């Protein structure tokens, strides 16, 4: 079932401003995406559907077609409920969603990225997890995050409070 | 050497307190022997045809 719905959003439902006519998929998102949040069965192995996970991640970060905070509110919680369930299964499928966060350290749309990039290491603490080249590039992501948060338009006490990254697992 | 500092103060008894014959033991021997394949083995399924 998830394999079929994986290709239902074609590039975040074609987030580019092309048609903006039939946004009923976003309306139907409150019923199909909510079903996936009620179960966590993708924990064990055999998950070659990382393209669908990327499509869901890019759907949250790209909602230019009929933008609605209330409608997109379910998508924000959809990503959070999925990362806490399963992780440490790959590395390419995780760096790509965080590639925008690593490059754009001041984007207002990075909120779905920074919590996932922080909650997942918190629930793992490299226990039963094998590091890779993804672990080598995380200090670079934190190095630019600190400078941008300080030098580039010092953030308010509200949003910067959520920028309290862990930066754990030293060596 | 013990069962006086601890042990007998609580409700407990020695394992072989009343045994005229000393307990005989079974150990693991490293001699590779031939034994029939067990059913429902995780691997090596054998079916007679």
């Amino acid at each position: 079932h998830v394999l079929d719905v994986g290709f239902l959003p074609d590039m975040r439902a074609a987030a580019s401003l092309d048609t903006a006519t039939f946004s009923t998929t976003e309306m139907a998102l409150a019923l199909n995406r909510y079903l996936c949040l009620a179960v966590l069965p993708l924990i064990t192995k055999c998950a070659p559907l990382f393209a669908g996970t990327e499509h869901r991640a890019i759907m949250v970060d790209s909602m230019l077609h009929t933008v609605y905070r209330l409608s997109r509110g379910r998508s924000l919680t959809k990503a959070q409920r999925d990362v806490i369930e399963d992780c440490l299964m790959a590395l390419c499928r995780y760096i790509r969603p965080s590639m925008l966060q690593h490059l754009l350290r001041r984007l207002v749309f990075d909120v779905p990225i920074l919590n996932e990039f922080a909650k997942m290491p918190l629930k793992l603490l490299t226990n039963h997890y094998e590091r890779c080249w993804k672990y080598y590039c995380l200090p670079t992501g934190w190095a630019n995050f600190g400078v941008t948060s300080e030098e580039e338009l010092h953030l308010t006490r509200k949003l910067f409070w959520g920028i309290f990254d862990s930066l754990a697992h030293k060596k | 050497r013990f069962f006086a500092i601890c042990g007998l103060q609580e409700g407990f008894e020695p394992f072989a307190i009343n045994m005229q014959r000393p307990v005989t033991t079974w150990f693991s021997k490293s001699l590779p022997q031939f034994e029939p394949v067990p059913p429902e083995h995780p691997h090596y399924e054998v079916a007679r045809m």
Binding site: L91, C92, I95, R96, M99, C132, W133, K134, Y136, C137, P139, A143, G146, S149, E150, E151, H154, F160, I163, F164, S166, L167, A168, K170, K171 | A4, I5, Q9
Partner: protein, 504 residues
């Protein structure tokens, strides 16, 4: 991304590289670019996941300390309009102070562990990192000073940093080579702190509010620094650096604090006593045994030369430098006379909160570690009986709230066999406690069954006193009854039975 490409793409790149390598074998095709040395840059010593950030943050406070100097002038007499030029680092310092807190709260094991002895999974730290940790401690001295209200209400946050920082030191390899002056600089900061408390007692003698920095910033962190060096049992690098002369100055000044008596010095004594106990174990010199200085081999006199001791302005009689620090034999007779008299609570005496915690943590470091050990083992048992005698002598005080501190301090003293101690002190006091417990409940049991609200609140205060006494005596014996339980069970003892009935 360039680091986690698919298997098909990686295979194509490897095939292209191998095919290209075969084609360049002829005609001597070879391209070489780069200019670097593999002696040091090749290894991970260039960046061990933190090296590239240590001076990034070390220099971060270097300019931050430069900017707050202008802010110091801003808060001194104004005319600077708070200097809003570089508040970005000020806001950053507000958001990086948790980072410099949680980082070492769980990774401190890696820092302290030596490469020769692994502690945990990863603890093999380079010598440069250990030296760089001292610089952070050296930079911590300039982080906070007599001006503590300059940066606002972040004092509890920052003092937590040096607590963890003081627990992430080595003091062994950093003192072997490198810039050892930074550790003495921290001791020189304590020397500045020593001048602060020396001025504080001067204000105390005068009978002010300009020296509250010491009791809130350095005193909490100086104590754990001596505990950490004592818990690790590192030993030296506290007196071999010729900095214990400042420690000696504190000992004399803090003792001159004890001999005084005034209402102003009330909350300073419990904090001063804790630091004194910490410093007592840290000092590798018997401050109370001048006679043992002959076989010292670690005193200031025998560090370099007698000339090296007279240049700084100290005569050869280093053991007599302390004006008020008698031989421990005199101290034992001093407390023993007090124990025989049976003094009251902190009203008449004040010795309990100043100096008896000092040798309480000092005697174990030498009683069974120095001479006459695999110096006075019997006196250690004698002190344990004496310290327990002053607690029972003070039973009945409505509000003293110093029993709980005393019981924790004397925890390691209980490691003395002393078979006669059970019949000497433990039995008579527990018998007196039982009679006191029975009297109060008898005053409550039959009275309730004999207005009602008048007596209901009467028993609440008395039971609180008993519970305070009960929780002050039990920890002393709870570590003693289990130690000798094996001996008591193997050889039945009549007195041991009586203790069971009294507690039962």
């Amino acid at each position: 991304p360039y680091d986690t490409l698919t298997a098909k793409e990686k295979a194509r790149d490897r095939e292209k590289a191998q095919e290209l390598l075969k084609f360049l074998q002829m005609n001597g095709y070879a391209v070489t670019r780069g200019l670097k040395d593999m002696e040091l840059d090749t290894s991970s010593i260039e960046k061990r996941f933190a090296f590239g950030f240590l001076q990034q943050l070390l220099r971060w406070m270097d300019i931050s300390q430069e900017f707050i100097a202008h802010l110091e002038a801003v808060v001194s007499s104004g005319r600077v309009e708070k200097s809003p030029h570089e508040q970005e680092i000020k806001f950053f310092a507000k958001i990086l102070l948790p980072l410099i807190n949680q980082y070492f709260t769980n990774h401190c094991l890696y820092f302290l562990s030596t490469p020769a002895k692994v502690l945990g999974s990863g603890g093999h730290a380079s010598n440069k990192e250990k030296e760089m940790i001292t610089s952070l401690f050296c930079k911590l001295a300039a982080l906070v000073r007599h001006r503590v209200s300059l940066f606002g209400t972040d004092a509890p946050a920052v003092v937590n940093c040096l607590h963890i920082l003081a627990r992430s030191l080595d003091a062994r390899t950093v003192m072997k080579s490198g810039p050892e002056i930074v550790k003495a600089g921290l001791r020189s900061f304590f020397e500045s702190a020593s001048e602060d408390i020396e001025k504080m007692v001067e204000n105390l003698r005068l009978g002010g509010q300009n020296l509250t920095y010491t009791t809130v910033a350095l005193l909490p962190v100086l104590t754990t620094l001596f505990q950490h060096i004592a818990q690790h049992q590192f030993g030296d690098d506290v007196i071999l650096d010729d900095v214990q002369v400042s420690c000696y100055r504190t000992l004399c000044s803090i003792y001159s604090l004890g001999t005084t008596k005034n209402t102003y010095v009330e909350k300073l004594r419990p904090a001063l006593g804790e630091c004194l106990a910490r410093l007592a174990a840290a000092m590798p010199v018997a401050f109370l045994e001048p006679q043992l200085n002959e076989y010292n081999a670690c005193s200031v006199y025998t560090t370099k030369s007698p000339r090296e001791r007279a240049i700084l302005g100290l005569p050869n009689s280093v053991e007599e430098m302390c004006p008020d620090i008698p031989v421990l034999d005199r101290l034992m007779a001093d407390i023993g006379g007090l124990a025989e008299s049976g003094a009251r609570y902190t009203e008449m005496p004040h010795v309990i909160e100043i100096t008896l915690p000092m040798l309480c943590s000092y005697l174990p470091r030498w009683w069974e570690r120095g001479p006459e050990a695999p110096v006075t083992s019997d006196h250690l048992n004698s002190l344990l009986g004496n310290i327990l005698r002053i607690i029972v002598n003070n039973l009945g005080i409505d509000e003293a709230t110093w029993m709980k501190r005393l019981a924790v301090f004397a925890q390691p003293i209980v490691s003395r066999a002393r078979p006669e101690l059970l019949h000497s002190h433990f039995i008579p006091t527990i018998g007196r406690l039982r009679k006191r417990a029975g009297k109060v409940v008898a005053e409550e049991e039959q009275l309730r069954l004999e207005e009602a609200e008048e007596g209901e609140l009467l028993v609440r205060d008395e039971f609180s006193v008993l519970c305070r006494d009960l929780y002050a005596l039990y920890p002393l014996l709870i570590r003693y009854v289990d130690n000798n339980r094996a001996h008591w069970l193997t050889e039945p003892n009549a007195n041991a039975e009586e203790l069971f009935r009294m507690v039962g």
